[PDB]
């Protein structure tokens, strides 16, 4: 119910506050829906479900120099298409469940 | 200016609820330190036509 | 009796000189707690958390459990440093009492007193060896 | 809560006060799930009548 | 002695298997129990007298 | 009834479907994807997930 | 090419041990090969891991004041892994007589 | 390491409640009747 700010149309569906241990099994079975559909080999973003917090937002990489400097390179995804397709299915489920 | 660490942040550190530095922070150097033999590099530096 | 009681509470103190170790805090998916991360041990799970009880009929021990505050259960404040590693410590509210808890905390305090940083252990060993052998301790956060 | 002298076995309100069954209740789902062993024997037989 | 020896090198090799283990602090860890047993005996004798 | 690719005619495509049964039967085996393994029967879904 | 993901470092075995002095002949052939294979590695402390590897050897022929607190002239040259441990004599040779 | 509830005072029942089933029933609901181990122990008198 906290975390990242996506438009959530499924919201009256009762769901408890997902902690980091429970967001693993959500994130693991979503990246297992891309390895079954597109049949990739190798990691394909599943690393995000085996350690650390799965509620990732704005993934970024940085290096800390010794002289008190840190170069964050924020890499966000550009246009997203399946998520644009998912948000219309998720807003049709609340219309016709 | 010599780089000390390389960190991957799932969420930028101003907004993450509980600090979770990347695990690569724990390593002594800033990457996977494979050792190399300097007496094997120095053969390929002095020979090699 | 005083000499026998003091030699019994010495055995009460010494048998409690342990370190509290954190097991896994699995979330509760059922509707009894719903989301508050309890501590799944096997017949001790229903004996450690009286807040998670089912009270079908108004019995005298279930009359007391009706006043149990529902949020005061499970972990409260996971203090984890490194993402992907073990947490440093957690603050839970299980069935443990205060008297035994106080003894256990003191034992943890004792270990902390006789513990030095890695910039001190290498400054002890290299001085206990008269700098014949000087050693390197890596400079990265051992949590 | 069952009462001893034949007085009907009532159940607990929201504010923890035993009100009688024969009325119209509003069981929230969570409650039904943790009391279906006592829903099925006391209040739901007072539904079918 | 040996002819060409370095006394800061020959001791660095001979004291090598000593400090490679944490047996140097067994005498240190034993002292923190000979203390706590001593106070809890002096407070156990003198609380009976 | 939502039976995805019921009228397909191309190739295998992607091994993934939501073949919901009609509501005369029980449509419960497609709502136990995430936090519903082991502790639940094959005739009920967890409403908290 | 993959620097930052994986950095090759000099081995902790082919360093001359700091107890050994430079009068030992096969302990300077380990230090000669260390300097020639110095810039080949992508370890950013390979200046200090090469420079202090000599200064471990002649640590009584040429005694020096390694100004970092905690690190003594004989401290082995695999210890210098952080930029705070770069000795101030190395950063400016005017502090070395 | 302990890995257990750091308690030392076990709530026990030394005098069990009667499982009376012919005369005078419904007065005593054992927790175990519904298949659950009760958190606080049930007995006529529960000592510590």
Pairwise CA distance, residues D21 & D32, whole Å? 15
Non-local CB neighbours of C88 within 8 Å, separated by 6+ positions: C79, C80, C81, C143
Q: Which residues of A touch B22 (CB under 8 A)?
A: 52
Contact exists between C and H (3 or more beta carbon pairs < 8 Å): yes
Pairwise CA distance, residues B26 & C142, whole Å? 6
| B25 alpha carbon, distance to own chain's centre | 9
Question: If DSSP codes are grouped into helix, strand and coil, which group holds residue G6?
Answer: strand
Pairwise CA distance, residues A74 & A62, whole Å? 8
**DSSP letter string over E11-28?**
HHHHTTTTTTSTTTTHHH
Task: Classify the C-alpha dihedral G13-G15-G16-G18 as positive or negative.
Answer: negative
How many CA atoms lie within 13 Å of G82's alpha carbon, on the beta-carbon side?
Answer: 14
The verdict on a CB contact (< 8 Å) between C18 and H9 is: no
| Residue C117, both tokens | 């940083």
Q: How far is G41 from chain A (nearest CA, A)?
A: 19
Which of H25, H26, H35, H36 is best to mutate for the D interface (most D CBs within 10 A)?
A: H26
Q: What angle do CA C37, C41, C42 make, to 5 degrees?
A: 125
First-residue to last-residue Cα distance in chain C: 48
Task: Locate all alpha helices (DSSP H) within chain C, ordered by sequence.
Answer: 2-14, 45-48, 60-65, 98-113, 118-128
**DSSP letter string over chain B?**
--EEEEEEESS-TTT-SS--B-GGGSSSSSSEEEEE-HHHHHHHHH---
Residue F6 touches chain C, beta carbons under 8 Å: no
What element of type H or E holds A64? strand A60-65
What chain C residue is nearest to E8 in terms of C-alpha separation?
C132
| Residue C119, both tokens | 């910039």
Residue C136 touches chain B, beta carbons under 8 Å: no
Q: How far is G83 from chain A (nearest CA, A)?
A: 6
Q: How far is A20 from chain G (nearest CA, A)?
A: 27
| Residue G35, both tokens | 């300097």
**Integer CA distances (angstroms), G81 to B4, B29, C139, E18, G85, in order:** 9, 7, 7, 26, 7
Pairwise CA distance, residues G9 & G78, whole Å? 10
Residue C132 touches chain E, beta carbons under 8 Å: yes
In chain A, count H helices and then E strands: 3, 2
The verdict on a CB contact (< 8 Å) between D2 and H26 is: yes
What chain C residue is nearest to D16 in terms of C-alpha separation?
C66
CB-based contact H32:H38 (threshold 8 Å):
yes
Residue A66 touches chain C, beta carbons under 8 Å: no
Non-local CB neighbours of G36 within 8 Å, separated by 6+ positions: B38, B41, B42, B45, B46
| B7 alpha carbon, distance to own chain's centre | 10
Q: Which residues of C touch D29 (CB under 8 A)?
A: 31
* Strand B32-36 with D18-19, pairing: unpaired
Facing residue for F34 by CB, picked from A14, A26, A39: A26
Pairwise CA distance, residues A12 & G29, whole Å? 74
Q: How far is G97 from chain B (nearest CA, A)?
A: 26
* Strand A69-74 with H45-47, pairing: unpaired
Q: CB contacts < 8 Å between C and G, how many?
A: 26
Residues 29-48 of F with CB under 8 A from C: 35, 39, 46-48
A9-17 LR contacts (CB < 8 Å, sep 24+): A9/A87, A9/A90, A9/A91, A9/A93, A9/A94, A10/A90, A10/A93, A10/A94, A12/A94, A14/F47, A14/F48, A15/F48, A15/F49, A16/C27, A16/C29, A16/C34, A16/C35, A16/F48, A16/F49, A17/C35
Pairwise CA distance, residues E28 & C116, whole Å? 13
| Residue D15, both tokens | 């504010």
Q: Which residue has the tokens 């039976």?
A: F3
Facing residue for C123 by CB, picked from G70, G76, G84: G70
Task: Locate all alpha helices (DSSP H) within chain D, ordered by sequence.
Answer: 29-33, 36-38, 45-48
Resolution of the deposited coordinates, in angstroms? 3.8
Question: What is the length of chain D?
Answer: 49
Q: Which partners does chain B have (≥3 C-beta pairs < 8 Å)?
A: A, C, G
Question: If DSSP codes are grouped into helix, strand and coil, which group holds residue A88?
Answer: helix
The verdict on a CB contact (< 8 Å) between C96 and H39 is: no
Breaks in chain F, after residue numbers (C to N greater than 2.5 Å): none
Pairwise CA distance, residues F49 & A16, whole Å? 7
């Amino acid at each position: 119910d906290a975390g990242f700010l996506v438009p959530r149309p499924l919201d009256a569906l009762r769901q408890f506050d997902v902690t980091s241990a429970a967001a693993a099994e959500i994130m693991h079975a979503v990246n297992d829906a891309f390895k079954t559909a597109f049949d990739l080999d190798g990691a394909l973003l599943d690393g995000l479900a085996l350690y650390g917090d799965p509620r990732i937002a704005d993934l970024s990489a940085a290096y800390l120099q010794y002289g008190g400097n840190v170069v964050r390179e924020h890499v966000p995804p550009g246009p997203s298409h399946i998520h644009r397709a998912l948000q219309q299915v998720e807003s049709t489920f609340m219309a016709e469940m | 200016d010599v780089i000390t660490n390389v960190l991957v942040a799932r969420v930028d550190p101003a907004q993450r609820g509980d600090a979770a530095v990347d695990i690569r922070a724990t390593h002594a150097t800033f990457a996977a330190a494979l050792p190399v033999d300097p007496a094997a590099i120095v053969v390929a530096m002095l020979c090699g036509q | 009796l005083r000499s026998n009681v003091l030699l019994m509470l010495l055995q009460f103190t010494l048998s409690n000189l342990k370190i509290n170790k954190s097991s896994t805090f699995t979330s509760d998916v059922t509707t009894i707690t719903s989301g508050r991360m309890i501590r799944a041990f096997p017949e001790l799970l229903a004996l450690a958390y009286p807040g998670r009880a089912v009270l079908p009929t108004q019995t005298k021990n279930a009359q007391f459990l009706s006043t149990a505050i529902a949020d005061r259960i499970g972990r409260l404040d996971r203090a984890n440093l490194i993402g992907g590693e073990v947490s440093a410590m957690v603050e839970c509210m299980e069935l443990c009492d205060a008297l035994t808890l106080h003894i256990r905390e003191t034992y943890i305090m004792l270990l902390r007193s006789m513990h030095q940083d890695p910039t001190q252990i290498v400054q002890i060993v290299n001085e206990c060896a008269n700098n014949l052998l000087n050693s390197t301790i890596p400079i990265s956060l051992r949590p | 809560v069952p009462r001893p002298n034949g007085l009907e076995p009532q159940l607990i309100d929201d504010g923890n006060v035993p009100r009688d069954i024969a009325g119209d209740w509003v069981y929230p789902s969570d409650v039904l799930q943790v009391s279906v062993a006592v829903f099925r024997d006391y209040v739901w037989p007072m539904v079918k009548a | 002695t040996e002819t060409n020896l370095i006394p800061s090198h020959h001791y660095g090799k001979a004291f090598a298997p000593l400090f490679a283990s944490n047996a140097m602090f067994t005498r240190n860890q034993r002292a923190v129990i000979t203390r706590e047993a001593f106070v809890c005996a002096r407070s156990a004798v003198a609380q009976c007298q | 009834v939502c039976m995805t690719n019921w009228a397909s005619l191309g190739d295998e495509g992607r091994g993934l479907e939501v073949r919901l049964p009609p509501p005369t039967d029980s449509s419960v085996h497609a709502y136990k994807t995430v936090l519903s393994r082991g502790y639940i029967d094959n005739a009920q879904f967890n409403p908290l997930a | 090419a993959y620097n930052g993901l994986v950095t090759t470092v000099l081995s902790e075995d082919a360093f001359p041990d700091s107890s050994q002095s430079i009068t030992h002949l096969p302990s300077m052939w380990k230090c000669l090969f260390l300097t020639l294979a110095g810039p080949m590695t992508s370890d950013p402390h390979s200046p200090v891991k090469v420079f202090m590897a000599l200064a471990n050897l002649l640590a009584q022929p040429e005694p020096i004041a390694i100004g970092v607190p905690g690190m003594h002239q004989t401290t082995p040259a695999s210890q210098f892994s952080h930029p705070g441990v770069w000795p101030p004599g190395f950063l400016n040779p005017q502090l070395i007589n | 390491e302990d890995t257990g509830l750091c308690t030392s005072f076990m709530l026990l029942d030394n005098i069990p409640s009667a499982h009376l089933t012919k005369e005078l029933i419904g007065f005593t609901w054992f927790m175990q009747m519904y298949q659950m181990t009760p958190p606080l122990p049930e007995g006529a008198v529960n000592r510590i």
